[PDB]
Every structure is written in C-alpha cells, then in structure tokens.
Amino acid sequence: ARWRGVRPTVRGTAMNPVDHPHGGGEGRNFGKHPVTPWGVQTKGKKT
Amino acid sequence: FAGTVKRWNFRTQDATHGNSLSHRVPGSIGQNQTPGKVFKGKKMAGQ
Amino acid sequence: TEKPLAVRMGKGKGNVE
Amino acid sequence: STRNGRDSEA
Amino acid sequence: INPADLRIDVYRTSGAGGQHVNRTESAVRITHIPTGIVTQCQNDRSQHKNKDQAMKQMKAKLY
RNA sequence: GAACCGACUAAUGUUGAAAAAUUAGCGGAUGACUUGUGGCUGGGGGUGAAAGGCCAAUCAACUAUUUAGCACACGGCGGGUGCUAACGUCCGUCGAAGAUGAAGGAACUAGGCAAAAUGGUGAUACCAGCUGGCUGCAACUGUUUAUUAAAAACACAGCACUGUGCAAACACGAAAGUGGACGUAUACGGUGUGACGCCUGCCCGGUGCCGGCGGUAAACGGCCUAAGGUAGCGAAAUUCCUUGUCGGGUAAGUUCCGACCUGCACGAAUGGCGUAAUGAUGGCCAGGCUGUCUCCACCCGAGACUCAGUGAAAUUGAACUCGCUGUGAAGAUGCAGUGUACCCGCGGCAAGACGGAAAGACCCCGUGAACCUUUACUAUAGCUUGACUGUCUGGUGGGUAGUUUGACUGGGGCGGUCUCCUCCUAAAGAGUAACGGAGGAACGGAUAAAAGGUACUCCGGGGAUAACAGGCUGAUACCGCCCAAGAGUUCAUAUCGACGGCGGUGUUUGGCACCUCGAUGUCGGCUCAUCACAUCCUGGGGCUGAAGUAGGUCCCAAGGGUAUGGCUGUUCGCCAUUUAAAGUGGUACGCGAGCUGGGUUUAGAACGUCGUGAGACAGUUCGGUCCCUAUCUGCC
RNA sequence: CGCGCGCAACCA
Ligand SMILES: [Mg+2]
Ligand SMILES: [Mg+2]
Ligand SMILES: [Mg+2]
Ligand SMILES: [Mg+2]
Ligand SMILES: [Mg+2]
Ligand SMILES: [Mg+2]
Ligand SMILES: [Mg+2]
Ligand SMILES: [Mg+2]
Ligand SMILES: [Mg+2]
Ligand SMILES: [Mg+2]
Ligand SMILES: [Mg+2]
Ligand SMILES: [Mg+2]
Ligand SMILES: [Mg+2]
Ligand SMILES: [Mg+2]
Ligand SMILES: [Mg+2]
Ligand SMILES: [Mg+2]
Ligand SMILES: [Mg+2]
Ligand SMILES: [Mg+2]
Ligand SMILES: [Mg+2]
Ligand SMILES: [Mg+2]
Ligand SMILES: [Mg+2]
Ligand SMILES: [Mg+2]
Ligand SMILES: [Mg+2]
Ligand SMILES: [Mg+2]
Ligand SMILES: [Mg+2]
Ligand SMILES: [Mg+2]
Ligand SMILES: [Mg+2]
Ligand SMILES: [Mg+2]
Ligand SMILES: [Mg+2]
Ligand SMILES: [Mg+2]
Ligand SMILES: [Mg+2]
Ligand SMILES: [Mg+2]
Ligand SMILES: [Mg+2]
Ligand SMILES: [Mg+2]
C-alpha cells in the first residue's frame, strides 16, 4: 500500500531537533507539547 | 639463516584472530625509554 | 592538626588531634 | 570549610 | 577487631571509563582470614574512602 | 539461486592497483525492485523509510579592572599553609635491602574470528545448506550514517487522539497562484504508537489544549498528596549494592537459562505483557568439524634477496650520530666521571632517537565561532484582538533571528567567596598575601533589558593549566627495627606481641604542577623479555613451644626453575585440577614505527535515571577504520 | 566527607 501513493511517514520524535520541534533527545525524549513540523499545536487546537 | 621461531624456538603469534602481518615475528625486542636499547645477545634471526 | 587524606592543598586549614 | 576570608584595613 | 587478623588487598576498578581510572588502584578488598569472609568496595573513586567503607562492611558482616 | 542491486564478516591494501578498493565468503534478487534518458526541487534553502544523512571527493548550513596571560625563580633569615613533606604554596625582608653497570579436537580466543566441514537429485572435478537446543530485542519484506556504526535505530501494515465542511485544514508563495485534490469526512493533514493475541489501571494540582469557572492524560506529564503504580512483568537492553540468593548447566560458569523479589531507579499506546514466522540481530550451550590452539613442520606459488633498465616518498639546524652511572627545564649519542669501541658495507629485527605522519581531538583559556535549547533577554514572520486587505493597536509568538549566559579557584566543574568593620597572621613606625585563623555591618558600578546544550562541533592559544608517564615529596602504602603490658600450662622475646616509638623503600592511594597540549597513544591479552632481592621451589645454616615425619620462625643464598583450565574485557579474584614451587617487585604499572583492540576513549541506537528541553550519567546495553618501505643508535 | 533522611559526589 505504497502502491496507493502514500510514501513513508517519519515521526517527529525520530528526527533531529533541527528537523522537527519534537526532534532531538538521548534515547526517547518528548518533553514538548505535540505540534506539527511547523510548531502548530496538533492535539485539540482548532482552525 | 633461520628466523626466531626456528632458531630460538620462539612461540609464533596467533595464526589468526586479527593478527596482521605478524605471525612468525620475534614480537618485542626490548623495553621502553629506560634501557632505550636492545640488550647484547638478544635472541634474533640469522644462521 | 592534620589535613584529610587524598585532599588538595587549599580550602582552609585542616582538623585537630 | 573556609569561612574566614574577611578582613578590613586602616 | 585486631587489624593484623585480617588483610587488605587493593586492585583496579572494573569498567574503567577513562585514562585515570584505567590505571588507579581505587578498588579494595578485606579478607578476614580466620573466618574466611570477604568484603569489597569500589563505590568511591578514592581508595582511602573505599578501604574505610569496606572495613565498615567487614565489621557489619562479622557482627 | 545467476545477471542485476547491495555491502555483514575476513584477510590484503593503508607514500594502495583504488582520495574506501581486493579476493574469499555474505544479503535482496517480481519488487517498498533495479536501471537508462530527460525534467523538477537551491542554501537557513532543498531533500531526507531520519543517519544531522545527502545536496559535485566540501556539509550542525601595589591599586582598579566581566579582571586575573604587572607569569618571576632560588637561596638566606622571620613566618602563614602543608606532614616544622615538596625544585610545594602564600607573604615580609636582603642498626643500613632495589631494580641496565601424526596425536589431540576450541585446550585458542573477548568471541570457534579465521579456517575446516556441510553441500546434488531421487552427487568422484568445478559446482554445491553446517545442524540442533535455550534465550534478549525487533513482528515481518524493507531503509539507514556515499568514505570506521545495517542495528534493538527508521519505515511498515494496524491502532488511537486530533485538526479539517471544501475557496478545507496545512504547506510553498510579500502576492497572484500552486500543491492538498480535478480529491470532499469510509477523504485529507498532523501527532503519537507500531503485525497479531491478552490488554491498556488511577491522577486535570502543574504546563498545554478545548469550552465558558469548568472539561480533557492513546495531551506534556505524575502515580501528606492532584492521585499515590493497577494488571502484568521483575538483579531486566533497566538491579548501585552484586559475581544478590537458590536451582540447572560445567571438573570448575563475574557470562547463559529457570526461579526468588530486597523494582538504588519496570509498568501499561515517549505502550505493558505474551508471541508462530522472520533476522549478514545480541547473549549462552551442544553435536559435527577442523592448525584456532597444544606446537608448529613441510610444500606450492607472489614478493623479499642478487644482476641488468628505469627510478620515487615521508623526513632533514648541523653532525667526526657508543654503553653505563650521575647531572641537567627534573627520562642524555652530545654534560661530568667512567667503561668500551679498527674503517666501511649488506640482509634482518624494531628497544631508543620523548622516531615520521596531523600548530592535541582530551583539558583549560579567549569578555573566540558556530549550530542546537528553552518558561534566558530583546526582537520579529505568522496567527489572533479591537479602532479607523491597509494603518494603528493589545495578546500570542524558539516558528525565526540577534544575542546571553562573571570572576576568584593549588587544572576546571561543583561548593564557597566577592563590599565595608575588628582582631591575629604582620617579623615593636606604616603597609604586607593565601579557598590562612576568628568574629561582625559580581558592592570602581560593561546594558534599561539576558539560561543553557554540544560526543556534530570549530578556531585561536596554553605544558601559563588538568587526565597518562617521568620528576620532586613520602602523609598514606609496603617493608623493617625499638620499647615490652601481656598471650604462650610455668615462662615477655619457640611463635606472638598491646600502649607507644624509630627508620628504609619509592611500592599503592596521594600532594605538587617542574617536563611534554606546533599530539610523550590508554587497561588487558599475546610475542619477547630483562633487572632487583624484601626468595615461592630447589641449596646451606641458627633457634624452636625441633622425638621422627612434617612444620614455625630467623640468617645466608638470585644459579636455575617458578602451571593448565572454568568465569569475566579485565589486572585482580574465586573455583577446578596440578606442581618441587606456582615468588614479590622495577623496567613510560617493560613491550601497539612488534601483534590484538575485548575494556576504555568520537560520531548510531536503546534502557534506567536527571533535565521543561537541547542533552547529560566513574550507570548500563548493541554497533563501531590500530598508518609508517628504518637515516642514526641499539641488537642478531 | 560537600550541600540541604534527601541531594551531590564530576571531565579526563
Ligand atoms: Mg536521531
Ligand atoms: Mg526547534
Ligand atoms: Mg614501542
Ligand atoms: Mg545525533
Ligand atoms: Mg560530499
Ligand atoms: Mg596581571
Ligand atoms: Mg602577578
Ligand atoms: Mg616555588
Ligand atoms: Mg585461555
Ligand atoms: Mg569470556
Ligand atoms: Mg566463520
Ligand atoms: Mg572453507
Ligand atoms: Mg539477558
Ligand atoms: Mg545503502
Ligand atoms: Mg559507513
Ligand atoms: Mg558497515
Ligand atoms: Mg494510560
Ligand atoms: Mg534470568
Ligand atoms: Mg505514556
Ligand atoms: Mg532484513
Ligand atoms: Mg592435525
Ligand atoms: Mg615552563
Ligand atoms: Mg644512554
Ligand atoms: Mg640519565
Ligand atoms: Mg612523533
Ligand atoms: Mg595547539
Ligand atoms: Mg575561570
Ligand atoms: Mg605593623
Ligand atoms: Mg608545567
Ligand atoms: Mg608555581
Ligand atoms: Mg602505552
Ligand atoms: Mg637475603
Ligand atoms: Mg571496542
Ligand atoms: Mg549518541
């Protein structure tokens, strides 16, 4: 189902801090409120 | 002209196990700075 | 008066005995 | 511990 | 306790995470010969503290 | 399983054949494949199954002093501090001792690495699975750090939350517009988790977010309080103590497997617990097999060696370039004393020339640099609020940027200190230092306005200042000796020897900061040793609390000898079984221009932990490039 | 044994 069109999706937390606000950490760290890769609050925040 | 292993019954270094270019060599021949020389009558190759 | 063991030189005078 | 570093002058 | 009854052995701390700890004989052990009991301490990084600690441990064991 | 695509191990190569290859093996090989041609995406930008990867061999783009870089050194005398230690530090003053003189068959090793072996169909060459058992982790096929890291990391199907009603949210765009999507909530974006099975407990006090004081945790989080950790699991990728305790396995098991629970510091979608299959995945055991090893031997080729032709290179102050002991900016071919040595090649070896290769990467320093970071400060794009898309305006705003984040300091950090007063230090005028001894009431003020991380790092410097080794020292350490209260039935001294004292050694832990930061490579193993004697055995004695046997202890003695395995990276240690004994030390804790790279000590990743976070941890765990053709000394 | 039974106890 990569046939369907959709490429793989890298989680923000997997990335480096320069790549995504969630990025960075030794081991698995996430002391950030969930945001888009452009720093917009992801859970709950309306538009 | 015999090498140390033939002439002086020197133990060969490991035939495998990472040992590089150094199978039947005499190993070390002296100490460090203190004597700063090879002692006379050191067991080495030749005849 | 002696300084404690494995202690560097400064940081005040030692303790009495 | 050191607690003696103080001194005045005249 | 009599100090001659037991002996004190010093050696190197396992997992020597640096050029200093690679060399230093900070790790200690007391064998209480007649009882045969052994204690050791490499918790501290100074040998002197370690020795004291292990002596305390030894005493506790004896008790 | 070929092509093709890859790149796990290996040895070679490391002035290469090659600015990442070689041969031997190894993985995928109808697909999330691979490839050709052309096009597009541009630098704070792209792209990234995410490694900070890749984007043309290039990629995180006296005093004062935010002042300590007017550094003093020694010797004398008066001191402080230290050990009335230091070639230490801070002021004032001019008895008796030491280190160059075939058979076996994993016993290898960190590890069966490498070999050997297995190999086909239902096999004589080439060709062509080693197999099985226990277990961690990850479901899986895939992807990843071009050029040290292929994995447990990323992706993954699946699950959940959340946004989004279409001119969608969101993204790129000063804007137009484009993507979303020619889709339209069974669709699309973002975030987390990660097949499947059983499940996913409590807390809304905090920080978010949503609604207007409430609500929300598969939001960030936590388990007298907001609530006190539920199921499950548990010395674990987490358990410091610890090699926990017991059991299994073994002759012996720091590893492994099963339990226990005392969880330093597990735990439920930064998921918990199971889990068949799969893995160049981690750990352990077994059979087979073997030169891995006991312990190497022979042979076959390619070099090496000699001749002929050609003909480099790093390096290089100059050299008429010895050993030792001392000295010395403190480890000497060059100094003193001394011993030795005809002159000159060649083949070798590699102990020294603190050898060559990199103006150390470690450490510190700089009122350096960069990135990253956040509730550091100041801004600001964007988003939002109103008043009159525009102007103004409040909020929000690491999304982005410019910065910031003191000094002293027996290296720095951490702790403490910083201004003023009094006393002592202070050596009978005044003054006079130390993270000196006692007490009291960033204080010459860098801005109005400021935390951090960097192991992704970088530059300039420093042996001005640390880690290694040397040196000085010897508190500690080790080894003696003196005194003898006693123990030893009696009896101090056969053997011990308290309370105390005096040394020696350089020998541990230290102190110092003298040597080196225009690099002196670090534990352990291996290969080689060599010296000391403070002798473990063997030799010779004395005393014995010595019947003998066997010891104990002391003296003399260094000629020779002085273990294999299990466990662990270990030294050490424990155990097994030996042995006449399994010496203790020095030798840059001998020996990496001799080997290894298991430990440590980069870049990946994870767990526990701390941190809001970046990240960090003398905590752990998996992965992780070891270069040098020898001029001189030395030696054969 | 530093700083408040807790924390820290570091870099090589
Ligand atoms: Mg990462
Ligand atoms: Mg950011
Ligand atoms: Mg060497
Ligand atoms: Mg990183
Ligand atoms: Mg490149
Ligand atoms: Mg000055
Ligand atoms: Mg000065
Ligand atoms: Mg001085
Ligand atoms: Mg062995
Ligand atoms: Mg092992
Ligand atoms: Mg193999
Ligand atoms: Mg083979
Ligand atoms: Mg395990
Ligand atoms: Mg690749
Ligand atoms: Mg690589
Ligand atoms: Mg690789
Ligand atoms: Mg929950
Ligand atoms: Mg277990
Ligand atoms: Mg959670
Ligand atoms: Mg695979
Ligand atoms: Mg054989
Ligand atoms: Mg100097
Ligand atoms: Mg010499
Ligand atoms: Mg000398
Ligand atoms: Mg050099
Ligand atoms: Mg430099
Ligand atoms: Mg400073
Ligand atoms: Mg005076
Ligand atoms: Mg110095
Ligand atoms: Mg000085
Ligand atoms: Mg070394
Ligand atoms: Mg003797
Ligand atoms: Mg390693
Ligand atoms: Mg890392």
Residue numbers in the entry:
A (entry chain C): 211 to 257
B (entry chain D): 118 to 164
C (entry chain N): 74 to 90
D (entry chain X): 9 to 18
E (entry chain v): 234 to 296
From the paper:
In canonical translation termination, a protein release factor binds to the aminoacyl site (A-site) of the ribosome and catalyzes the release of the nascent peptide in the ribosomal peptidyl site (P-site). In these proteins, the GGQ motif required for the catalytic activity of peptide release is universally conserved. Taken together, the post-translational modification helps to stabilize the glutamine conformation in the PTC of the ribosome, and orients the carbonyl oxygen of the glutamine to coordinate a water nucleophile in the hydrolysis reaction.
In both canonical and nonstop termination complexes, the orientation of the methylated glutamine sidechain assumes the same well-defined conformation, which differs significantly from previously determined conformations of unmodified GGQ motifs. The post-translationally added CH3 group orients towards the nascent peptide exit tunnel, positioning its -N5H- imino group close to the O4′ of the ribose in U2506. The carbonyl oxygen of the glutamine sidechain points towards the base of A2451 and A76 of the P-tRNA.
